[PDB]
Design a protein around this ligand. Structure first.
Ligand code: EMC
Lengths: 51, 51
């Protein structure tokens, strides 16, 4: 049972991983991108801070 | 839909496991049964032969 599941469950976290690191990009770049308001030199600062 | 994959993994896992236990349980009970017989079936032949 354990093995059966730990096997299935592991692939489920490996899926959750990439699906999650995505959330991280989407959150961070929607943030840097938000620098359009202040100057483009602001993007350099913002985007460097982020990416 | 991750939950879906999960919940069922859970069920199948534990069931499939019980099934194994059950299968293994039988095997031993078979062994016993047969062995028990092979033992008597064996003393017996000698005796019938003697008779
Ligand atoms: C001696 C009959 Hg199994």
């Amino acid at each position: 049972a354990l093995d059966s599941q730990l096997t299935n469950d592991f692939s489920e976290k490996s899926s959750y991983f990439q699906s999650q690191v995505d959330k991280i990009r989407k959150e961070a770049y929607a943030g840097a991108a938000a620098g359009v308001v202040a100057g483009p030199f602001g993007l350099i600062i913002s985007y460097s801070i982020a990416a | 839909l991750s939950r879906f994959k999960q919940e069922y993994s859970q069920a199948a896992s534990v069931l499939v496991g019980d099934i194994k236990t059950l299968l293994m349980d039988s095997q031993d009970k078979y062994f016993e049964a047969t062995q028990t017989v092979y033992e008597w079936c064996g003393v017996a032949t000698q005796l019938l032969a003697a008779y």
